[PDB]
């Protein structure tokens, strides 16, 4: 799924607390409303624990 | 040298060599991810371009 | 700069009940993720209880689940405590814990807390 | 059952780089951060290393932090050892709704 053109708001995910891993490679989760990006993606599977 | 903190100032040199941080983390002066050596070594061959 | 002021304690009670409040202020109290968090005197670290910005989920440890309550408000920037039923393992110093964006990041918040000894 | 174990009484040395390592058993650490934090015994702690590589501002460049995956643990570091006051060492991570603290490190003859 593509999501793009639109306000991005990482604010709902990280102040929830029903998922357990949010381990962000790459770039810090810490500050994510300050950045600016072109494209992003968002792919959905499920796998055991 | 391939790393440098900002742009260099006409006719300066530096000689300092230590870990160049390149991430949003510091790897605290250890080599590791999101940080290399801003100095690394030519190669030549005798029968190259 | 970011003031964190405990009292709460000061007073021995076995079984009974206390309420704890920790005040705060210098920043938004409505944005961030409070917690609270204990330690024995000459013991190790734990965790007590994390509360979220609105006061809708709140989580305990087993050990101390079917007791323990938490509480906010945003309009007077207070943390409220109570405590009921308490053994005589609860000689702890009590910090109320301040979050940054969830609980992964880290806690990074700690005030110099209140001395409560029951007996 | 998720704990974190990690020694009581290392870095007793003068000056140079040792290490600290602060391992689970119930779960993989690598997959939620762990941070690091030191107390001051008789006053307020501290944090030295959040997000599991940084530190805050205002903390000294020495301070090092890594994660091996092959042996399931985490590196604690330090490279100056400088007259810094008397303190112990905790582990933190994440299983799942609830937080797990590390039991301790202490660290009182540099």
């Known amino acids: 799924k593509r999501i793009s053109n639109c306000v991005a708001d990482y604010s709902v995910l990280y102040n929830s607390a029903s998922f357990s891993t949010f381990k962000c490679y790459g770039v810090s989760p810490t500050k994510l409303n300050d950045l600016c990006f072109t494209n992003v993606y968002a792919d959905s599977f499920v796998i055991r624990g | 040298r391939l790393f440098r903190k900002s742009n260099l100032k006409p006719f300066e040199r530096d000689i300092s060599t230590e870990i160049y941080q390149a991430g949003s983390t510091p790897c605290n002066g250890v080599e590791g991810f999101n940080c290399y050596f801003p100095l690394q070594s030519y190669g030549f061959q005798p029968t190259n371009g | 700069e970011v003031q964190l002021v405990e009292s709460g304690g000061g007073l021995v009670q076995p079984g009974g009940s206390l309420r704890l409040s920790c005040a705060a202020s210098?920043?938004?109290?409505?944005?961030?993720?409070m917690s609270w968090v204990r330690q024995a005197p000459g013991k190790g670290l734990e965790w007590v209880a994390n509360?979220?910005?609105?006061?809708?989920?709140?989580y305990y440890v087993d050990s101390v689940k079917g007791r323990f309550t938490i509480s906010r408000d945003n309009a007077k920037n207070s943390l409220y405590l109570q405590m009921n039923s308490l053994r005589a393992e609860d000689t702890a110093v009590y910090y109320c814990?301040?979050?940054?964006?969830?609980?992964?990041?880290?806690?990074?918040?700690w005030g110099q807390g209140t001395l409560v000894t029951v007996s | 059952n998720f704990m974190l174990t990690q020694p009581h009484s290392v870095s007793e040395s003068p000056g140079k780089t040792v290490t600290i390592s602060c391992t689970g058993s119930?779960?993989?650490?690598?997959?939620?951060?762990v941070q690091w934090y030191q107390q001051r015994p008789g006053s307020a702690p501290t944090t030295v290393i959040y997000?599991?590589?940084?530190?805050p501002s205002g903390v000294p460049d020495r301070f090092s932090g890594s994660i091996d995956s092959s042996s399931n643990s985490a590196s604690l570091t330090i490279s100056g050892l400088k007259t810094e006051d008397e303190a112990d060492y905790y582990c933190?991570?994440?299983?799942?709704?609830?937080?797990?603290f590390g039991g301790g490190t202490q660290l009182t003859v540099l």
């Open positions: 210098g920043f938004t109290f409505s944005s961030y993720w």
């Open positions: 509360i979220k910005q609105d006061g809708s989920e709140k």
């Open positions: 814990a301040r979050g940054q964006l969830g609980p992964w990041v880290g806690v990074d918040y």
């Open positions: 997000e599991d590589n940084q530190r």
């Open positions: 933190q991570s994440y299983d799942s709704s609830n937080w797990v």
């Open positions: 119930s779960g993989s650490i690598a997959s939620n951060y």
